[PDB]
């Protein structure tokens, strides 16, 4: 059992939960690959195990309802070749997949999740309405609420439900007479898919993209989001009056719409989950990555910093203020957001909860440690262990 | 072979060098332990020696030659006879440079070929050991124009104990347990401070008292040796625009010289082989001065900066840390002592990975040690995927000799 040390306090724990690890990771005794971003009747094996998880989690192992439910999943697969989850189970498995997400620093919140059941969905126009209930419920006028919407589970012979966008809110990315990009350069591909399928492109650096929703065995269909439903935050700084002039904005709702939910052997290729932002996500990665909006030098010029030498730490100073601007703006607009110090301190509380409850916690060090001020947060000094537990959110290929 | 992506540019390479990794790390396909700090007969000696000799003869464009098999047979005959063997001088220089080259947690490896190797394998006593060390400190410091160097003391051998330096670095500040429960000085150094005292050192009571050296000759208790103050170059810390900063009374020393690691070359072990380069400013500014379990100055600086420390979202911790790093860079520059900031160091490490991809087909790197502890994603290494594995020659950790 791996020994795990915290170097700030000098405290030691053992990760016994690592024993239950399901799907193998990318590392071998020969080499570590932890820093890499992207690393038939077996369906009954995983279903049986997930069902035992549910009943132990409600102190109902070895009793009547536990025995009972085991047989009907057995009979469901025998007759149909698959099975349906009870409502309580789909709830319990959504929370568990979030709980088991090693790259998420916000799992202290994993027990507070609103689960929308879109398993009776049957058309792309139905998708849009379900997605639209989600967005408006999750946004909640800025008092954000964690939510996931689960569309039908995949089956043989029939196509997949899929959202083609990586998130529900993305900004446009436009090429030019010189190749380079206006807007968000991450979303250059989906932007050109949307232009293909009928959307007339805007001219701005912060155009909210239209959705591309895919009913099974039908091609994707464009859907224009209601602008009154996409809450956005214009960015200003508390004491740098010119910051507002830079015209920067970000949206309120972080909602990943490209990952595949897996519960008890069942696979849901369309299942958007949403929470609220950690401020480094917007202020550090989205606005300052060189391949993203890359605003770092523009802000430094406006601050009259000396950009001619790296040792003035002008990059560091300008980055800190961009993060100050994100936090101040979201708080003034009363949109839920959490800074990387508060977020990481709650994660340390989570680890300790999880140590007592489950005997460990799969955590991915490179992604839990924030991208500014790493060693100023407690997670930097906490050793972690990474492994795969089910249920889980999984990456998946793109549907083109 | 593992595919490696650079997410900032789009570059894609394949680490073929990892296939040669001969010793095992701590990860399995079940679980990654990459974030853990400490993740750890004649024929086996023979097979590592054979491999190193092959490495050396590759480096001198004499692979498969007369001289090459000459050395291979020679080493076996010496192992059969003596149970071990001796490196030629040129083999030792090449082996010390490869060990640096091979060190996955060093971001300054663009410099790996520029290393001054001092051969002290004739050292006879703790007293002679001390003399060799003073000369190392003197040459490396070079009045502030620092030069990378390593001194190699006699190798491990059956029949006689090891040479050991008990201090983890040649220059360390004392850490005295206080009256209440606090530490005065550097809390990382309470243990070695206590060993020096119990070995008859007279402790000071400052926050920056330089520690004496505890030097162990084979089958001998360690002996205390004081470093002459004029040999230990230090830097008073000031801030270019925060004049009150000088009143903190903070200093750091010029020379980073690790003295507690084991140098392995072709199966032979040198448990005493201190090595030194020059600092990257974050080791001092961020870790040494701002870690809660170290000098822990972050809040005091932020209060002095008139920041609002009652709420995290004002980012007072980030702002104060940035200026503490400014103070470090400015102060070493003022004093004309070599130092590299985390933006320049990571950008030269990017050129090292490129150089190494063409020379060897990859490069062992520990992402969590390479990415700086402030402003991580503002440096290019954050966006570089990396493959961590173990090559030999190597610097390895080893247990404390007490
Ligand atoms: C409630 C507040 C939440 C916060 C502050 C938060 C924070 C974060 C952050 C900062 C990341 C790093 C992702 C990146 O760097 O792009 C992340 C990853 C992730 N989070 Fe959370 N999260 C929250 C809620 C949730 C919820 C509700 C779910 C699912 C139900 C979830 C599941 C995940 C997953 C699967 C990842 C991995 C993303 C990927 O690998 O691309 N999180 N989270
Ligand atoms: C010349 C300038 C150098 C720079 C800028 C530099 C930079 C660094 C830094 C920042 C670390 C991380 C240390 C920590 O966080 O405690 C490190 C580690 C290391 N360096 Fe370098 N270094 C230099 C020279 C050298 C030399 C000359 C050698 C050996 C001949 C060396 C071998 C190592 C080793 C073995 C480690 C790992 C130490 C440990 O794991 O505790 N370095 N280096
Ligand atoms: C190469 C490296 O794995 C990659 O840049 C990772 C590092 N850590 C990260 N951590 C988070 N939270 N999000 C990321 O996108 C990344 N990127
Ligand atoms: C727990 C964690 O592995 C530990 O704090 C590591 C993180 N990365 C590091 N990186 C460097 N360069 N030096 C360190 O001491 C550490 N410490
Ligand atoms: C649920 C959730 C919350 C949050 N704060 N962040 C995310 C991920 C954002 C997308 N990244 C992959 C770019 C998801
Ligand atoms: C040779 C060398 C250069 C450098 N820049 N830094 C170090 C590390 C100092 C000690 N750390 C292990 C705490 C060593
Ligand atoms: Cl995002
Ligand atoms: Cl140090
Ligand atoms: Gd101006
Ligand atoms: Gd001033
Ligand atoms: Gd004071
Ligand atoms: Zn690993």
From chain A residues 343-382, the ones with a CB under 8 A of any chain B CB are 365-366, 369-376, 380-381
Distance from C-alpha of B16 to C-alpha of B362, rounded to nearest angstrom: 6
The CA R_g of chain B, rounded to the nearest whole Å, is 23
DSSP state of B284: I
DSSP for B106-145, please give it: -S-GGGTT--EEEE-TT--SHHHHHHHHHHHHHHHHGGGS
DSSP for B351-375, please give it: HHHHHHHHHHS--B--HHHHS-SSS
Please judge whether B344 and A311 are an interchain contact, meaning their C-beta atoms are less than 8 angstroms apart: yes
What dihedral do alpha carbons A296, A298, A301, A302 form, nearest 10°?
Answer: -110
Q: Are A130 and A120 in contact (CB under 8 A)?
A: no
Please tell me the distance in Å from B214's CA to the nearest CA on chain A: 26
Q: Specify the 3-state DSSP secondary structure of B40.
A: coil
- Residue in this structure with the two tokens 């605003």, named with its chain if needed: A295
Please judge whether B33 and A324 are an interchain contact, meaning their C-beta atoms are less than 8 angstroms apart: no
Q: Comparing C-alpha atoms, which of B353, B351, B347 is closest to residue B387?
A: B353
Q: B181 Cβ partners below 8 Å, 6+ apart?
A: none
Please judge whether A383 and B37 are an interchain contact, meaning their C-beta atoms are less than 8 angstroms apart: yes
| Beta bridge partner(s), residue B262 | B396
Please state, in angstroms and as integers, the Cα–Cα distance from residue A389 to each residue in A100, A273, A395, B31, B393, following that order.
6, 18, 14, 11, 38
Question: Across the A/B interface, how many CB contacts are shorter than 8 Å?
Answer: 204
- Whether B301 and chain A come into contact, CB under 8 Å, resolves to no
User: Is the C-alpha dihedral spanning B125, B131, B133, B136 positive or negative?
Assistant: negative
Q: Are B171 and B96 in contact (CB under 8 A)?
A: no
Count of Cβ atoms closer than 10 Å to residue B10 Cβ: 8
Residue B7 catalytic?
A: no
Distance from C-alpha of A151 to C-alpha of A156, rounded to nearest angstrom: 16
Nominal resolution (angstroms): 1.9
Distance from C-alpha of A363 to C-alpha of A376, rounded to nearest angstrom: 19
Count of Cβ atoms closer than 10 Å to residue A345 Cβ: 15
Q: Specify the 3-state DSSP secondary structure of A255.
A: strand
Lateral strand order in the sheet of B223-225: B164-165, B213-216, B223-225
Exposed e or buried b per residue across B168-202, where buried means at least 16 C-beta atoms within 10 angstroms of its C-beta: bbbbbbbbbeeeeeebbbbbbbeebbbbbeeeebe
Q: Which one of B76, B78, B283, B299 is the catalytic residue?
A: B283
Q: Which one of B207, B278, B316, B323 is the catalytic residue?
A: B278
- Whether B294 and chain A come into contact, CB under 8 Å, resolves to no
Q: Are A114 and A122 in contact (CB under 8 A)?
A: no
Q: Are B46 and B82 in contact (CB under 8 A)?
A: no
Q: Are A396 and B400 in contact (CB under 8 A)?
A: no
Q: Comparing C-alpha atoms, which of B262, B296, B164, B276 is closest to residue B220?
A: B164
Residue A164 catalytic?
A: no
Q: Where are the beta strands (DSSP E) in chain A?
A: 3-5, 12-14, 114-117, 147-150, 162-163, 173-174, 182-183, 211-214, 221-223, 232-234, 249-251, 255-256, 260-263, 266-268, 273-274, 277-278, 337-338, 392-394
Q: A40 Cβ partners below 8 Å, 6+ apart?
A: none
Q: B146 Cβ partners below 8 Å, 6+ apart?
A: B140, B254, B255, B276, B277, B278, B337, B338
Please provide the distance, in angstroms rounded to a whole number, between the alpha carbons at the two ends of chain B: 42
Exposed e or buried b per residue across A222-257, where buried means at least 16 C-beta atoms within 10 angstroms of its C-beta: ebebeeeeebbbebbbeebeebeebebebbbbbbbb
Tell me which chain B residues have a C-beta less than 8 angstroms from the C-beta of A290.
8
Distance from C-alpha of B225 to C-alpha of B213, rounded to nearest angstrom: 5
Residue A182 catalytic?
A: no
Distance from C-alpha of A18 to C-alpha of B30, rounded to nearest angstrom: 8
Q: Comparing C-alpha atoms, which of A341, A340, A389 is closest to residue A363?
A: A389
Burial of A307 (0-12, 13-18, 19+ CB in 10 A): middle
Distance from C-alpha of B115 to C-alpha of B34, rounded to nearest angstrom: 29
Please state, in angstroms and as integers, the Cα–Cα distance from residue B296 to each residue in A116, B237, B293, B358, following that order.
47, 15, 7, 43
Which residues lie at CB < 5 A from ion ligand 10? B 241
Tell me which chain B residues have a C-beta less than 8 angstroms from the C-beta of A31.
2, 15, 18, 21, 25, 27, 387-389
| Most distant pair of Cα atoms in chain B: their distance | 73
Ligand closest to CA B109: 2
Burial of B232 (0-12, 13-18, 19+ CB in 10 A): middle
Partner residue opposite A373 with nearest CB, options B321, B344, B385: B321
Q: Are A18 and B30 in contact (CB under 8 A)?
A: yes
Collect contacts of A80-86 with beta carbons under 8 A, ≥24 apart: A81/A156, A82/A43, A82/A153, A82/A155, A82/A266, A83/A47, A83/A266, A84/A119, A85/A263, A85/A264, A85/A266
Distance from C-alpha of A158 to C-alpha of A216, rounded to nearest angstrom: 7
Q: A133 Cβ partners below 8 Å, 6+ apart?
A: A116, A149
Length of chain A: 400
Count of Cβ atoms closer than 10 Å to residue A56 Cβ: 12
Distance from C-alpha of A50 to C-alpha of A93, rounded to nearest angstrom: 8
Tell me which chain B residues have a C-beta less than 8 angstroms from the C-beta of A293.
none
Please judge whether A373 and B34 are an interchain contact, meaning their C-beta atoms are less than 8 angstroms apart: no
Q: Comparing C-alpha atoms, which of B278, B252, B280, B298 is closest to residue B371?
A: B280
Experimental method: X-ray
Number of C-alpha atoms within 13 angstroms, CB side, residue B82? 11
Residue B220 catalytic?
A: no
């Amino acid at each position: 059992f791996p020994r795990v040390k915290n170097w700030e306090v000098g405290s030691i724990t053992y990760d016994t939960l690592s024993a239950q690890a399901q799907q193998d990771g990318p590392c071998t005794p020969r080499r570590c690959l932890g820093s890499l971003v992207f690393p038939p009747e077996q369906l009954l094996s995983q279903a049986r195990d997930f069902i035992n998880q549910y009943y132990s989690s409600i102190k109902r192992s070895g009793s009547q309802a536990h025995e009972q439910r085991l047989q009907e999943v057995e009979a469901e697969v025998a007759a149909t070749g698959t099975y349906q989850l009870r409502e309580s189970e789909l709830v319990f498995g959504a929370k568990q997949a979030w709980r088991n997400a090693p790259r998420c620093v916000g799992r202290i919140q994993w027990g507070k999740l609103q689960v929308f059941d879109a398993r009776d969905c049957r058309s792309a126009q139905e998708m849009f309405t379900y997605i639209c209930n989600h967005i408006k419920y999750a946004t909640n006028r800025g008092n954000l609420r964690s939510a996931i919407t689960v569309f039908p589970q995949r089956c043989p012979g029939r196509g997949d439900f899929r959202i083609w966008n990586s998130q529900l809110v993305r900004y446009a990315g436009y090429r030019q007479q010189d190749g380079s990009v206006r807007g968000d350069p991450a979303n250059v591909e989906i932007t050109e898919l949307c232009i293909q399928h009928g959307w007339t492109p805007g001219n701005g650096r912060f155009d909210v993209l239209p959705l591309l929703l895919q009913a099974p065995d039908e091609p994707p269909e464009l859907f224009l989001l209601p602008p009154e439903l996409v809450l956005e935050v214009p960015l200003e700084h508390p004491t740098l009056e010119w910051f507002a002039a830079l015209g920067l904005r970000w949206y309120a709702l972080p909602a990943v719409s490209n990952m595949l939910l897996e519960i008890g052997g069942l696979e849901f290729p369309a299942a958007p989950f949403s929470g609220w932002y950690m401020s480094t996500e917007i202020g550090t990665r989205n606005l300052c990555d060189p391949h993203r909006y890359n605003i770092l030098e523009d802000v430094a010029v406006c601050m009259d910093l000396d950009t001619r030498t790296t040792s003035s730490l002008w990059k560091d100073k300008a980055a800190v203020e961009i993060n100050v601007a994100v936090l101040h703006s979201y708080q003034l607009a009363k949109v839920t957001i959490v800074d990387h110090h508060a977020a990481t301190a709650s994660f340390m509380k989570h680890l300790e909860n999880e140590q007592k409850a489950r005997g460990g916690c799969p955590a991915d060090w490179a992604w839990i440690v924030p991208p500014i001020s790493g060693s100023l947060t407690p997670v930097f000094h906490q050793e972690m262990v990474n492994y795969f537990l089910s249920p889980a959110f999984r990456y998946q290929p793109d549907p083109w």
